[PDB]
Design an enzyme around this catalytic site. Structure first.
Site, PDB file in Angstrom:
ATOM      1  N   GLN A  66       0.899  -1.127   0.053  1.00 10.90           N
ATOM      2  CA  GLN A  66      -0.010   0.136  -0.025  1.00 10.90           C
ATOM      3  C   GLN A  66       0.957   1.218  -0.077  1.00 10.90           C
ATOM      4  O   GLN A  66       1.759   1.350   0.941  1.00 10.90           O
ATOM      5  CB  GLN A  66      -1.024   0.144   1.432  1.00 10.90           C
ATOM      6  CG  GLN A  66      -1.928  -1.281   1.227  1.00 10.90           C
ATOM      7  CD  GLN A  66      -3.017  -1.074   2.566  1.00 10.90           C
ATOM      8  OE1 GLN A  66      -3.344  -0.128   2.550  1.00 10.90           O
ATOM      9  NE2 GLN A  66      -3.079  -2.028   3.067  1.00 10.90           N
ATOM     10  N   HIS A  85       7.507  14.113 -20.955  1.00 11.52           N
ATOM     11  CA  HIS A  85       8.520  15.061 -21.752  1.00 11.52           C
ATOM     12  C   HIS A  85       9.996  14.722 -21.528  1.00 11.52           C
ATOM     13  O   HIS A  85      10.500  14.574 -22.707  1.00 11.52           O
ATOM     14  CB  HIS A  85       8.390  16.370 -20.955  1.00 11.52           C
ATOM     15  CG  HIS A  85       9.434  17.479 -21.490  1.00 11.52           C
ATOM     16  ND1 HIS A  85       9.027  18.632 -22.325  1.00 11.52           N
ATOM     17  CD2 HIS A  85      10.570  17.520 -21.193  1.00 11.52           C
ATOM     18  CE1 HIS A  85       9.975  19.195 -22.814  1.00 11.52           C
ATOM     19  NE2 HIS A  85      11.028  18.670 -21.905  1.00 11.52           N
ATOM     20  N   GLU A  86      10.441  14.373 -20.474  1.00 16.13           N
ATOM     21  CA  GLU A  86      11.796  13.961 -20.288  1.00 16.13           C
ATOM     22  C   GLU A  86      12.004  12.371 -20.934  1.00 16.13           C
ATOM     23  O   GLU A  86      13.090  12.413 -21.496  1.00 16.13           O
ATOM     24  CB  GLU A  86      12.028  13.687 -18.651  1.00 16.13           C
ATOM     25  CG  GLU A  86      12.088  15.192 -18.011  1.00 16.13           C
ATOM     26  CD  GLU A  86      13.122  16.161 -18.749  1.00 16.13           C
ATOM     27  OE1 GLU A  86      14.207  15.662 -19.060  1.00 16.13           O
ATOM     28  OE2 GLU A  86      13.059  17.224 -18.688  1.00 16.13           O
ATOM     29  N   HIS A 112      12.898  12.837 -24.481  1.00 19.77           N
ATOM     30  CA  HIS A 112      14.220  13.068 -24.582  1.00 19.77           C
ATOM     31  C   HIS A 112      15.002  11.715 -25.025  1.00 19.77           C
ATOM     32  O   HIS A 112      16.109  11.848 -25.813  1.00 19.77           O
ATOM     33  CB  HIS A 112      14.880  13.734 -23.420  1.00 19.77           C
ATOM     34  CG  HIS A 112      14.625  15.415 -23.604  1.00 19.77           C
ATOM     35  ND1 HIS A 112      14.390  16.011 -24.699  1.00 19.77           N
ATOM     36  CD2 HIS A 112      14.289  15.904 -22.683  1.00 19.77           C
ATOM     37  CE1 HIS A 112      14.357  17.357 -24.272  1.00 19.77           C
ATOM     38  NE2 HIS A 112      14.148  17.232 -23.110  1.00 19.77           N
ATOM     39  N   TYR A 120      21.009  19.953 -27.821  1.00 21.81           N
ATOM     40  CA  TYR A 120      20.378  20.783 -27.077  1.00 21.81           C
ATOM     41  C   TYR A 120      20.822  21.991 -27.080  1.00 21.81           C
ATOM     42  O   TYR A 120      21.259  22.772 -25.920  1.00 21.81           O
ATOM     43  CB  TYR A 120      20.607  20.203 -25.680  1.00 21.81           C
ATOM     44  CG  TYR A 120      19.415  20.522 -24.437  1.00 21.81           C
ATOM     45  CD1 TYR A 120      18.083  19.972 -25.053  1.00 21.81           C
ATOM     46  CD2 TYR A 120      19.546  21.265 -23.487  1.00 21.81           C
ATOM     47  CE1 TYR A 120      16.870  20.262 -23.968  1.00 21.81           C
ATOM     48  CE2 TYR A 120      18.484  21.727 -22.630  1.00 21.81           C
ATOM     49  CZ  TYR A 120      16.967  21.134 -23.108  1.00 21.81           C
ATOM     50  OH  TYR A 120      16.090  21.469 -22.263  1.00 21.81           O
ATOM     51  N   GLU A 153      13.210  20.271 -27.525  1.00 21.41           N
ATOM     52  CA  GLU A 153      12.260  20.613 -26.313  1.00 21.41           C
ATOM     53  C   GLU A 153      10.757  20.414 -27.119  1.00 21.41           C
ATOM     54  O   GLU A 153       9.801  19.958 -26.089  1.00 21.41           O
ATOM     55  CB  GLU A 153      12.238  22.060 -26.094  1.00 21.41           C
ATOM     56  CG  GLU A 153      13.657  21.850 -24.766  1.00 21.41           C
ATOM     57  CD  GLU A 153      13.300  21.232 -23.782  1.00 21.41           C
ATOM     58  OE1 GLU A 153      11.962  21.259 -23.022  1.00 21.41           O
ATOM     59  OE2 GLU A 153      14.108  20.183 -23.162  1.00 21.41           O
ATOM     60  N   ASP A 156      -2.085  28.498 -14.130  1.00 18.69           N
ATOM     61  CA  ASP A 156      -0.619  28.891 -14.731  1.00 18.69           C
ATOM     62  C   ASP A 156      -0.096  27.501 -14.979  1.00 18.69           C
ATOM     63  O   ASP A 156      -0.289  26.543 -14.776  1.00 18.69           O
ATOM     64  CB  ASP A 156       0.065  29.597 -13.906  1.00 18.69           C
ATOM     65  CG  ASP A 156       0.616  29.225 -12.801  1.00 18.69           C
ATOM     66  OD1 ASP A 156      -0.224  28.422 -12.180  1.00 18.69           O
ATOM     67  OD2 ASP A 156       1.620  29.417 -11.929  1.00 18.69           O
ATOM     68  N   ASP A 188      20.001  29.882 -21.618  1.00 23.72           N
ATOM     69  CA  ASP A 188      19.189  28.563 -21.756  1.00 23.72           C
ATOM     70  C   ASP A 188      19.812  27.977 -23.046  1.00 23.72           C
ATOM     71  O   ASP A 188      18.745  27.609 -23.969  1.00 23.72           O
ATOM     72  CB  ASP A 188      17.510  29.005 -21.717  1.00 23.72           C
ATOM     73  CG  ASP A 188      16.772  27.820 -21.925  1.00 23.72           C
ATOM     74  OD1 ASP A 188      17.132  26.969 -21.530  1.00 23.72           O
ATOM     75  OD2 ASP A 188      15.647  28.069 -22.501  1.00 23.72           O
ATOM     76  N   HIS A 233      13.975  26.413 -24.459  1.00 24.12           N
ATOM     77  CA  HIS A 233      12.587  26.135 -23.619  1.00 24.12           C
ATOM     78  C   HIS A 233      11.685  27.497 -23.987  1.00 24.12           C
ATOM     79  O   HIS A 233      10.675  27.464 -23.788  1.00 24.12           O
ATOM     80  CB  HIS A 233      12.903  26.239 -22.235  1.00 24.12           C
ATOM     81  CG  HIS A 233      13.648  25.232 -21.519  1.00 24.12           C
ATOM     82  ND1 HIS A 233      15.130  25.203 -21.493  1.00 24.12           N
ATOM     83  CD2 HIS A 233      13.036  24.037 -21.338  1.00 24.12           C
ATOM     84  CE1 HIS A 233      15.227  23.639 -21.060  1.00 24.12           C
ATOM     85  NE2 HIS A 233      14.001  23.064 -20.704  1.00 24.12           N
TER      86      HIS A 233
HETATM   87 CA   LIG Z   1       0.164  26.514 -10.725  1.00 27.54          CA
HETATM   88 CA   LIG Z   2       2.931   0.581   2.631  1.00 28.33          CA
HETATM   89 ZN   LIG Z   3      12.993  18.889 -22.038  1.00 29.10          ZN
HETATM   90 ZN   LIG Z   4      13.988  21.198 -19.704  1.00 26.11          ZN
END
Ligand SMILES: [Ca+2]
Ligand SMILES: [Ca+2]
Ligand SMILES: [Zn+2]
Ligand SMILES: [Zn+2]
Ligand SMILES: O[C@@H]1[C@@H](O)[C@H](O)OC[C@H]1O
Ligand SMILES: O[C@@H]1[C@@H](O)[C@H](O)OC[C@H]1O
Ligand SMILES: O[C@@H]1[C@@H](O)[C@H](O)OC[C@H]1O
Ligand SMILES: O[C@@H]1[C@@H](O)[C@H](O)OC[C@H]1O
Ligand SMILES: [Ca+2]
Ligand SMILES: [Zn+2]
Length: 316
Positions: A61, A142-143, A146, A157, A166, A200, A226, A231
């Site tokens: 659990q 997302h990751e 990659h 990158y 990205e 947001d 960056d 990004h």
């Molecule tokens: Ca938020």
């Molecule tokens: Ca547990």
């Molecule tokens: Zn990324």
């Molecule tokens: Zn990133």
């Protein structure tokens, strides 16, 4: 470890209850044996040593607050697997059923999650900028995307190539979120970003200008931060991907939407077939027009919509 495959129950970061595949050997380990060579979730125990200890649980659990980051990292890793397998017939990120390993409770107050070339790494955030990032399925996918990129196109990158890199992860991160179909949207990280703020997220694919990101090539960031705004400039391609799916009018250019499924088919084929490590925005357009031609015909609506969307964001 070697044990009997079992199914446990727990709650993720946002409190959502869900089942997870476990392996029982005295303790119940977060080891999913039903997907490829397995999915393994590890406990970093607030340190930076990777991967850490294979997450062990006494009663199968996972309702403790300390378990929540491990549940989502384990569960959503499997959703991402199910997406690439069922939708694109890709077995794991490398296409050969490589094991998907993830580490949670990495460091302390760590406002980031990343694929390190071999495994996933999830920080718990600071509680104001981020909550445990594994709670965001789009971040997880997302990751993990990659890794797919590295095992195919190998997009660098930096500069436009990194912006594409990205955008590919935002596109398929969002498509995985729709595949799960719980609370899909066209934003990134909304589920884990700024818990005290509602509505947001990190960035918007439908309206990148909402957060100051470019929605047109002429507004692309050209600085050095960056890695050249990977990004930031990704919004130009995210806007294109959004227009291909949902359609709309942008800078006077009308785009007919073809749906999310075809958007994924077009971009998955462009990534696995035509993109190269140094593909730029213009070459991505060509990669998407060629992919749509292969799948639907040069005169098809899909090819037209692709051209329209890249015209709208100024990518010729
Ligand atoms: Ca938020
Ligand atoms: Ca547990
Ligand atoms: Zn990324
Ligand atoms: Zn990133
Ligand atoms: O961002 C919204 C988008 O997600 C929806 O599909 O169409 C309206 C937009 O406001
Ligand atoms: O209107 C946007 C604003 O909300 C944001 O703060 O900065 C970029 C603008 O495009
Ligand atoms: O010249 C560009 C124009 O063609 C486009 O419509 O919007 C941005 C401008 O920079
Ligand atoms: O400066 C670079 C710019 O020339 C290119 O258009 O997009 C990436 C930036 O890093
Ligand atoms: Ca999202
Ligand atoms: Zn969402």
């Amino acid at each position: 470890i070697t044990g009997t495959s079992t199914v446990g129950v727990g709650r993720g970061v946002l409190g959502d209850q869900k089942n997870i595949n476990t392996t029982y050997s005295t303790y119940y380990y977060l080891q999913d044996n039903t997907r490829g060579n397995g999915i393994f979730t590890y406990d970093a125990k607030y340190r930076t040593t990777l991967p850490g200890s294979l997450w062990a649980d006494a009663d199968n659990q996972f309702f403790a607050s300390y378990d929540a980051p491990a549940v989502d990292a384990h569960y959503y890793a499997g959703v991402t697997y199910d997406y690439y397998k069922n939708v694109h017939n890709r077995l794991s990120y490398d296409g050969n059923n490589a094991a998907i390993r993830s580490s949670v409770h990495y460091s302390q107050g760590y406002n980031n999650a990343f694929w390190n070339g071999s495994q996933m790494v999830y920080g718990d955030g600071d509680g104001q900028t981020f909550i445990p990032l594994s709670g965001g399925i789009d971040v997880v996918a997302h990751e993990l995307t990659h890794a797919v990129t590295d095992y195919t196109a190998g997009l660098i990158y930096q500069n436009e190539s990194g912006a594409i890199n990205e955008a590919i992860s935002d596109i398929f991160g969002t498509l995985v979120e729709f595949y799960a179909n719980k609370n899909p949207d066209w934003e990134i990280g909304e589920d884990v970003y700024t818990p005290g703020i509602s509505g947001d997220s990190l960035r918007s694919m439908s309206d990148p200008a909402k957060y100051g990101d470019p929605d047109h090539y002429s507004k692309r960031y050209t600085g050095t931060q960056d890695n050249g705004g990977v990004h930031i400039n990704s919004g130009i391609i995210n806007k294109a991907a959004y227009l291909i799916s949902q359609g709309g009018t942008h800078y006077g250019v009308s785009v007919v939407g073809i749906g999310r499924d075809k958007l994924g088919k077009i971009f998955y084929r462009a990534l696995t077939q035509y993109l190269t490590p140094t593909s730029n925005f213009s070459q991505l357009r060509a990669a998407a027009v060629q992919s749509a031609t292969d799948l639907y015909g040069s005169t098809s609506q899909e090819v037209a919509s692709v051209k329209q969307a890249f015209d709208a964001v100024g990518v010729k």
